[PDB]
């Protein structure tokens, strides 16, 4: 199943902020090469293009220096990311002149075709595509044309295939030849389809601009089916081509990442099949990204759907817009599959939304296995409604965009099951205003039956019935959050290896809600201070270190925390048992006796030193962090039993002490962790999981990336981010209100990083001179004004540093005030329990904590 993406020459692709994700298609067509004195040339050498009257001067100096060479290098560069990618040059396009002359004579055909190969070979291309629009009728006078174009097109294609084949017998590389073909009967009548088709790998059908403001009434411009007899469609065009004998296996169906517009449409019905007046004022087309930004269910435009054509359109009473969306793209991809066609071609990739929604939809739908219907998918845009008091819930609205599936323009109450809205609170569902494809759940203001001390998980199922596409199943239940009146948690790791009492830098209990004290440890299946952990105390041979570790200031720290809790009585201080390289959990978790023994010893430790709960930091079950710790496959279900039992023991303690003791874990981001821990079964025992949304990348790898980005960078599709990890957690079924997003107050980086794109996503050299983990404190002292410059990846919302001159080029990846703000903002919009960070000692300025606090609690 192929996917042809047309990519425009007139975007500077090396500069483009978002770049091209070539893992979502199979063929990249570079639009366009042009013809000039019978020869194929770069578009910058097409005077007709580089000096058009229409948008002129400021934007015409641009065109003269179009960066074609650089574009072609960047695009054929994308083979690193998709090795099976083919890149072809598309020659021609709308209004491109010179085919009729180029094809005229055996001689002019010879020089065109030789230059076509020369272009193909010069830029390392996999084939040639001819977009002659159109032979014989010349698009009715847009381009020069002659009645002999019909046979001359045949001879031209014959000659190209001969020469590509000749070259193939010598290089052993197969070369593609394709055309973009017109959808009209006039097109089929001006070319010899049966003669031509043996020369071509496939025929890209231009099944768009089928109708437009040149017609007296509105219609669909790129519809899958014909809803009336006079409306052209993908189906009517494919049937036309099959009837002329073109095999289904050589036809690609076209789609458009832009709309056709009609103005002055009579305001009747939905605007569809209505009479349209003057188009003189019309923009003609509006690209999909602009539709998303300013038109689809926005600014007075209503979204409508034609359930026969399988096509969306918009109308606001005067302007009608016909476009391609997620639902039409799915129906087109199902048409391709059901009719055995070659695939999906689209014009053109840069018109898509920033996050490549159409390109991504077409990939996902076209390589969906049949007989496995797809579930509707959700995300969250507004995930939190916050209690005003213990009983009073103000009005608010959960907003869940779909990521897979397309809501009907108006959904019904029965399309959505919401569970967990508290008793005596009414709600309704609907399509969220100002979003193209989102469920709103409006929660009526109200009074809850009993006091809300803890977050309420609200669970939203989007039924197969809510959606346009054909054979989909109900969504997984989407978690959002009713938050109790005190709002999100702000949790700090506080290291026990700092002597807090004699430190001039103190812990700010007015800004934290929670502290994890790092760490208690496990010895002989008993919980002990870190000073009794012989593996830690003697991690290093030097006695001066071991003596500092033997004298770890734990007692002093426990008195320090006791004071702090006396001064800030709503502060919760948990003891963290474990951490990096901490032993004993696999053994402790094994049997009911070993778990009993561990839980009772932990409980004893907790009471002895004045803690308000327990956090387990087992790093990590089953894989043992790749043999840093003892592990077993029984860890997976034994961790569940350990937490069940810790929770029971803590219930016993709170029932005896008239108080509530928290239980939490710190959990990792990587797929292997997620597959090692029964996340859907443990969350019930936990107040929250402190997800370590950092250490994604570092010196252990030979390429740079963001260690802690809140969003996945546009230029590293599929890469780790808080969003990607926390979404994976939610799809295991963890409620949002039991997730805590993590910030790191330390950096990772790479040395020997080349000075290309400021070191971001580059190959690095030998890492013996690597920074390791410089703290924000070290960045302030040694990096920030010392020849590193700070950059910002605005798609990832992640800062980074780069110094060309330090150890062969050094890239530093970290969290700062700005990224922490965005993590805190994600927590709030996603309905998460709150924010955590590691660790309090790493920023003595207070800025990083202040950044979180300012955003999160204000």
């Amino acid at each position: 199943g192929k996917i042809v993406s047309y990519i425009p020459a007139w975007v500077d692709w090396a500069k483009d902020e978002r770049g091209v994700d070539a893992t979502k298609f199979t063929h990249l067509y570079y639009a366009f090469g042009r013809i000039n004195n019978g020869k194929v040339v770069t578009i910058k050498e097409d005077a007709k293009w580089t000096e058009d009257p229409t948008i002129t001067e400021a934007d015409r100096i641009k065109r003269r220096n179009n960066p074609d060479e650089s574009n072609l290098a960047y695009l054929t560069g994308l083979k690193a990311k998709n090795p099976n990618l083919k890149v072809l040059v598309s020659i021609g396009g709308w209004e491109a002149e010179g085919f009729s002359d180029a094809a005229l004579t055996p001689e002019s055909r010879e020089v065109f075709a030789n230059s076509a190969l020369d272009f193909m070979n010069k830029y390392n291309l996999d084939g040639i595509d001819l977009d002659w629009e159109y032979p014989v009728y010349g698009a009715w006078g847009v381009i020069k044309s002659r009645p002999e174009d019909k046979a001359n097109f045949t001879a031209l294609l014959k000659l190209l295939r001969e020469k590509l084949d000749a070259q193939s017998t010598t290089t052993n590389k197969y070369y593609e030849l394709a055309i973009a073909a017109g959808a009209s009967k006039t097109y089929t009548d001006s070319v010899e389809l049966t003669k031509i088709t043996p020369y071509l790998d496939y025929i890209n059908l231009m099944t768009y601009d089928l109708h437009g403001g040149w017609d007296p009434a509105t219609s669909h411009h790129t519809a899958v089916y014909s809803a009336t007899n006079n409306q052209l469609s993908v189906d009517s065009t494919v049937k036309l081509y099959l009837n002329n004998g073109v095999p289904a296996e050589k036809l690609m169906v076209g789609g458009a990442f832009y709309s056709r517009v009609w103005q002055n449409v009579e305001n009747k019905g939905t605007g569809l099949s209505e009479k349209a007046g003057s188009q003189a004022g019309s923009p003609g087309t509006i690209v999909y990204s602009e539709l998303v930004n300013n038109y689809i269910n926005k600014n007075g435009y209503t979204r409508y759907w034609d359930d026969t054509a399988k096509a969306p359109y918009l109308f606001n009473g005067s302007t009608f817009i016909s476009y391609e969306d997620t639902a039409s793209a799915a129906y087109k991809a199902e048409y391709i599959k059901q009719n055995n066609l070659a695939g999906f071609m689209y014009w053109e990739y840069s018109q898509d939304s920033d996050s490549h929604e159409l390109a991504n939809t077409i990939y996902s739908r076209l390589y969906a296995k049949s007989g496995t219907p797809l579930s509707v998918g959700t995300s969250v845009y507004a995930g939190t409604v916050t209690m005003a008091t213990y009983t009073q819930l103000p009005a608010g609205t959960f907003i869940l965009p779909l990521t897979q599936g397309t809501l009907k323009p108006v959904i019904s109450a029965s399309d959505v099951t919401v569970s967990g809205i508290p008793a005596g609170i009414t709600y309704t569902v609907a399509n969220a205003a100002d979003h193209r494809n989102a469920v709103a759940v409006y929660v009526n203001g109200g009074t809850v039956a009993s006091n809300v001390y803890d977050p309420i998980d609200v669970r939203v199922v989007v039924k197969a019935s809510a959606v346009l596409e054909a054979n989909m199943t109900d969504s997984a239940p989407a978690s959002v959050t009713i938050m109790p009146k005190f709002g999100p948690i702000l949790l700090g790791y506080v290291p026990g290896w700092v002597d807090w009492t004699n430190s001039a830098y103190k812990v700010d209990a007015t800004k934290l809600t929670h502290i994890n004290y790092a760490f208690a440890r496990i010895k002989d299946n008993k919980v002990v201070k870190i000073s009794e952990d012989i593996n830690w105390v003697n991690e290093f041979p030097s006695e001066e270190i071991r003596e500092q570790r033997r004298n770890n200031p734990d007692d002093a720290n426990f008195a320090y925390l006791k004071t702090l809790k006396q001064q800030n009585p709503s502060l919760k201080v948990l003891v963290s048992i474990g951490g990096w390289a901490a032993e004993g959990f696999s053994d402790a978790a094994l049997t009911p006796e070993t778990r009993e023994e561990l839980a009772n010893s932990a409980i004893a430790f907790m009471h002895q030193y004045g803690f308000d709960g327990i956090d387990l930091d087992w790093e990590y079950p089953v894989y043992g962090a790749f043999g840093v710790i003892k592990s077993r496959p029984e860890d997976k279900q034994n961790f569940t039993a350990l937490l069940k039992l810790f929770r029971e023991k803590l219930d016993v303690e709170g029932a005896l002490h008239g108080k509530y003791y928290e239980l939490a874990i710190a959990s990792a981001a990587a797929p292997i962790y997620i597959n090692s821990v029964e996340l859907d079964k443990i969350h019930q025992y936990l107040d929250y999981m402190s997800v370590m949304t950092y250490d994604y990348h570092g010196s252990w790898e030979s390429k740079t990336a963001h260690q802690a980005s809140v969003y996945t960078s546009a230029l590293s599709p599929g890469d780790f981010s808080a969003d990607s990890v926390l979404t994976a957690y939610r799809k295991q079924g963890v409620p949002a209100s039991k997730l805590v997003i993590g910030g790191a107050f330390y950096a990772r980086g790479w040395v020997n990083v080349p000075n290309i794109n400021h070191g971001l996503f580059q190959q690095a050299g030998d890492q013996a001179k690597n920074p390791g983990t410089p703290t924000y404190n070290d960045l302030v002292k040694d990096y920030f004004d010392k020849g590193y410059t700070r950059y910002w990846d605005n798609s990832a919302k992640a800062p980074y540093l780069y110094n060309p001159d330090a150890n062969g080029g050094t890239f530093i990846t970290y969290d700062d005030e700005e990224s922490l703000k965005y993590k805190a903002e994600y927590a709030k919009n996603q309905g998460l329990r709150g924010v955590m960070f590691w660790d309090y000692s790493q920023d003595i300025s207070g800025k990083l904590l202040g950044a979180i606090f300012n955003e999160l609690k204000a």
Side-chain angles (χ1 to χ4, degrees):
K2 300 163 155 110
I3 298 169
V4 169
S5 168
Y6 276 88
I7 286 281
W10 46 82
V11 171
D12 188 336
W13 293 104
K15 287 192 194 324
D16 182 85
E17 191 217 286
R18 308 270 151 182
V20 178
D21 185 2
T23 70
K24 310 287 171 143
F25 45 81
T26 62
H27 288 77
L28 195 161
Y29 281 27
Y30 184 71
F32 293 100
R34 293 289 166 83
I35 307 179
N36 173 219
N37 303 333
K39 299 166 169 203
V40 171
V41 75
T42 253
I43 202 176
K44 98 162 101 75
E45 313 256 347
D46 180 34
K48 147 87 225 156
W49 184 77
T50 53
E51 279 97 47
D52 213 26
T54 291
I55 233 264
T56 23
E57 206 47 41
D59 306 308
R60 194 157 46 81
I61 310 134
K62 221 80 215 172
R63 291 184 165 199
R64 282 173 262 277
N65 313 265
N66 197 61
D68 287 293
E69 274 196 289
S70 154
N71 276 351
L72 287 157
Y74 170 94
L75 304 160
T76 57
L78 301 172
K79 289 165 184 200
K81 304 182 179 173
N82 174 9
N84 291 279
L85 176 69
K86 296 164 102 52
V87 180
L88 319 221
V89 54
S90 187
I91 301 164
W94 190 250
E95 303 190 311
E97 307 163 13
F99 278 110
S100 196
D101 287 353
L104 210 204
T105 163
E107 216 138 33
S108 58
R109 284 196 298 269
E110 182 64 22
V111 345
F112 172 89
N114 280 336
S115 58
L117 267 82
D118 289 335
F119 194 106
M120 196 191 70
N121 295 329
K122 180 170 165 46
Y123 300 109
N124 304 317
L125 298 188
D126 304 291
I128 295 167
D129 171 66
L130 294 195
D131 293 10
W132 180 347
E133 305 174 29
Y134 308 93
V136 180
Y137 64 107
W140 329 98
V142 173
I143 63 161
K144 179 148 71 162
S145 72
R146 312 178 164 79
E148 49 265 77
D149 290 353
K150 177 164 175 164
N152 293 350
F153 189 46
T154 306
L156 182 56
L157 289 172
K158 195 192 190 210
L159 184 71
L160 295 161
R161 173 52 80 198
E162 285 172 342
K163 302 166 100 82
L164 294 169
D165 287 5
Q167 198 180 290
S168 276
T169 58
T170 312
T171 56
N172 313 126
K173 211 112 285 168
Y174 183 70
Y175 302 113
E176 304 195 339
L177 189 71
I179 68 172
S184 71
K185 189 108 186 316
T186 306
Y187 189 92
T188 53
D189 283 321
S190 317
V191 298
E192 316 190 84
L193 289 175
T194 58
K195 287 176 214 175
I196 221 81
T197 291
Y199 311 134
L200 297 174
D201 292 278
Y202 47 80
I203 291 179
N204 298 112
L205 298 169
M206 286 184 290
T207 44
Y208 42 72
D209 302 325
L210 293 181
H211 295 288
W214 54 86
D215 290 327
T218 64
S219 204
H220 307 295
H221 94 96
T222 192
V224 191
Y225 301 103
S226 289
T228 45
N229 319 26
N230 304 138
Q231 174 229 308
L232 306 171
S233 64
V234 167
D235 184 45
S236 81
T237 315
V238 168
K239 288 177 179 161
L240 174 66
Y241 277 66
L242 299 165
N243 287 330
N244 283 85
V246 184
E249 304 80 30
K250 289 202 165 184
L251 297 180
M252 300 271 281
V253 169
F257 290 5
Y258 70 94
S259 64
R260 295 316 298 195
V261 179
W262 282 250
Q263 284 184 164
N264 295 121
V265 173
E266 295 188 348
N267 189 1
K268 288 171 208 183
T270 64
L272 180 59
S273 306
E274 300 297 337
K275 290 184 290 162
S278 177
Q279 307 305 314
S282 177
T285 66
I286 302 168
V287 300
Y288 189 74
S289 49
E290 172 67 4
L291 295 185
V292 167
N293 277 351
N294 288 305
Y295 296 79
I296 303 163
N297 199 22
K298 281 183 180 159
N299 294 130
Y301 289 80
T302 303
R303 170 163 75 93
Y304 292 122
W305 172 253
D306 180 329
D307 204 27
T308 300
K310 304 297 188 195
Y313 59 102
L314 302 186
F315 194 47
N316 69 351
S318 188
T319 298
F320 174 95
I321 299 174
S322 160
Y323 68 107
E324 181 101 277
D325 82 350
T326 54
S328 71
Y331 282 100
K332 285 195 185 174
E334 297 291 334
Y335 189 86
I336 281 149
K337 275 156 45 193
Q338 150 74 36
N339 295 283
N340 299 300
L341 302 169
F344 205 133
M345 170 273 279
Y346 47 73
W347 175 269
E348 50 85 344
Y349 184 78
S350 79
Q351 296 169 332
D352 210 347
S353 73
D354 295 314
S355 62
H356 309 297
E357 176 162 78
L358 295 176
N360 290 344
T361 305
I362 283 155
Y363 184 85
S364 299
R365 267 283 198 330
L366 188 65
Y367 301 126
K369 188 130 285 156
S370 312
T372 320
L374 296 171
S375 9
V376 169
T378 59
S379 73
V380 179
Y381 173 93
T384 300
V385 189
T386 302
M387 226 81 50
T389 72
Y390 281 136
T391 177
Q392 195 182 290
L393 181 53
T397 150
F398 298 129
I399 300 167
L400 299 92
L402 317 209
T403 64
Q404 182 154 274
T406 309
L407 298 180
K408 297 174 334 188
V410 172
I411 49 165
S412 283
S414 18
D415 286 311
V416 186
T417 80
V418 170
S419 349
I421 294 274
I425 297 292
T426 53
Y427 63 99
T428 56
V429 316
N431 295 254
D434 292 330
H435 291 89
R436 62 198 181 289
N437 195 16
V439 176
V441 172
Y442 302 89
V443 176
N444 205 11
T447 275
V448 176
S450 68
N451 285 160
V452 200
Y453 301 116
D454 288 338
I456 302 163
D457 185 39
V458 182
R459 285 278 174 167
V460 180
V461 175
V462 171
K463 300 199 108 163
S465 93
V467 135
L468 288 163
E469 296 80 344
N471 296 284
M472 297 196 76
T473 62
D474 287 34
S475 59
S479 166
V480 295
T481 295
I482 297 170
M483 285 286 303
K485 57 173 196 211
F486 292 127
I489 69 166
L490 174 24
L491 182 151
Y493 274 92
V494 177
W497 39 96
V498 170
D499 174 20
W500 292 100
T501 305
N502 300 119
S503 165
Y505 308 104
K506 300 298 188 194
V507 177
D508 194 342
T510 72
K511 291 186 174 45
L512 300 184
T513 59
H514 288 69
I515 294 180
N516 284 350
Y517 184 75
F519 292 105
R521 288 293 162 91
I522 290 175
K523 193 194 185 158
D524 262 288
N525 214 287
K526 303 290 192 219
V527 176
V528 297
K529 294 170 189 175
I530 199 164
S531 51
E532 297 283 314
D533 185 350
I534 313 153
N535 221 272
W536 188 75
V537 165
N538 300 331
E539 155 177 19
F540 293 99
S542 311
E543 276 295 329
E544 67 187 8
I545 297 179
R546 290 141 98 101
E547 178 82 349
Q548 196 170 7
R549 288 153 87 136
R550 281 188 301 260
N551 297 305
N552 198 60
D554 294 283
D555 284 322
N557 286 339
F558 304 144
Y560 178 82
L561 299 160
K562 174 189 201 185
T563 78
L564 266 186
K565 283 167 57 44
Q566 282 161 8
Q567 298 307 283
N568 318 82
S570 71
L571 185 68
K572 276 152 148 41
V573 179
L574 297 84
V575 65
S576 298
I577 307 183
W580 188 248
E583 301 172 341
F585 278 104
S586 189
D587 286 346
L590 265 175
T591 83
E593 297 83 38
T594 52
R595 288 169 223 144
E596 191 80 11
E597 178 179 28
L598 187 75
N600 291 322
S601 177
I603 295 294
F605 190 101
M606 182 191 79
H607 281 308
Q608 194 171 338
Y609 298 117
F611 290 107
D612 302 320
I614 294 168
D615 167 67
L616 297 186
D617 298 3
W618 179 351
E619 302 190 8
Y620 308 90
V622 5
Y623 62 110
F626 304 118
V628 180
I629 244 70
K630 184 161 171 214
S631 67
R632 297 172 173 81
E634 25 284 357
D635 296 347
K636 171 165 188 160
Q637 33 295 115
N638 288 351
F639 185 39
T640 313
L642 197 74
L643 294 170
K644 187 186 177 154
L645 188 62
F646 268 67
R647 194 57 261 170
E648 282 159 6
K649 295 281 180 258
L650 295 165
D651 284 338
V652 165
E653 300 313 302
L656 291 172
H657 289 78
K659 104 169 71 219
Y660 178 74
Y661 293 102
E662 287 186 359
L663 187 58
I665 66 180
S667 55
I672 193 174
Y673 182 93
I674 285 169
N675 178 56
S676 301
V677 173
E678 309 183 290
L679 295 176
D680 192 39
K681 289 164 155 184
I682 73 180
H683 60 90
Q684 74 174 311
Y685 305 130
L686 299 175
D687 296 79
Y688 46 91
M689 318 173 187
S690 284
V691 187
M692 299 172 273
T693 50
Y694 46 80
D695 300 321
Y696 298 142
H697 295 293
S699 78
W700 66 90
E701 295 166 320
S702 35
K703 189 187 158 152
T704 71
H706 300 297
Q707 72 116 157
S709 53
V710 63
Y711 296 101
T712 291
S713 178
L715 288 27
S716 190
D719 216 339
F720 290 103
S721 71
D723 182 46
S724 84
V725 171
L726 293 167
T727 292
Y729 271 65
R730 286 170 287 187
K731 296 182 184 319
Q732 298 288 307
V734 189
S737 54
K738 295 193 174 184
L739 291 177
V740 171
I741 187 171
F745 286 14
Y746 65 88
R748 298 183 100 98
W750 286 269
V751 296
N752 292 313
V753 174
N755 195 350
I756 298 153
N757 300 323
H758 315 300
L760 206 217
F761 303 135
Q762 305 304 123
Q763 293 293 138
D766 199 283
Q767 298 313 310
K769 288 185 194 67
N770 188 97
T773 51
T775 63
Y776 189 80
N777 295 142
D778 302 322
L779 297 179
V780 166
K781 284 145 198 132
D782 299 326
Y783 293 71
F784 290 154
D785 284 312
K786 317 299 154 60
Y788 288 81
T789 134
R790 188 199 173 267
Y791 303 91
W792 181 255
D793 178 338
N794 196 58
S795 68
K797 296 293 184 307
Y800 57 107
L801 316 177
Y802 187 66
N803 178 350
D805 305 301
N807 297 127
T810 52
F811 179 92
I812 304 296
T813 165
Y814 67 113
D815 270 318
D816 69 356
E817 291 167 288
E818 197 174 6
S819 57
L820 290 170
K821 181 180 75 185
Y822 283 107
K823 291 182 162 182
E825 175 191 75
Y826 192 76
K828 291 151 28 166
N829 302 334
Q830 295 295 309
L832 302 194
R833 185 68 197 87
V835 181
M836 157 290 263
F837 64 89
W838 177 284
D839 87 21
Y840 203 94
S841 71
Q842 298 175 333
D843 179 27
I844 64 174
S845 78
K847 287 189 220 298
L848 297 189
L849 171 58
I852 298 168
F853 175 84
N854 287 353
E855 180 63 22
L856 190 73
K857 342 272 281 143

